[PDB]
Write a structure and sequence with these properties.
The structure is a homotrimer. By secondary structure, the first copy, chain A, is an all-beta fold. The first copy, chain A, has no helices and two strands. Chain A has a two-stranded antiparallel ribbon. In chain A, strand 1 and strand 2 form a beta hairpin. The first copy, chain A, is flat and about 25 Å long. Chains A and B meet through strand 1 of A and strand 1 of B. The complex binds N,N',N''-triethylbenzene-1,3,5-tricarboxamide (2KN). Chain B: It comes from Enterobacteria phage T4.
């Protein structure tokens, strides 16, 4: 399914969309 | 959601689009 | 299709899921 549409980037983890910024 | 470009570059999902990872690194 | 479900983040590249950590 689609990631949130909220001006933030997402990566795929554990069957979820997780913010990229958390890893940066 | 559709495939990302297949062009040797990594993409992340943003705003219902595929965006280059490199932009954020 | 789904990325691996293994506690790790993935990005999309070349029609595949590739570890985010490789790029960081
Ligand atoms: C210009 C913003 N770039 C990043 O924040 C960035 C880039 C990189 C990056 O370019 N890595 C290439 C080795 C890595 C990280 C990272 O490992 N953050 C952990 C807190 C962050």
């Amino acid at each position: 399914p689609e990631a949130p549409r909220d001006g933030q980037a997402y990566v795929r983890k554990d069957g979820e969309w997780v913010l990229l910024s958390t890893f940066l």
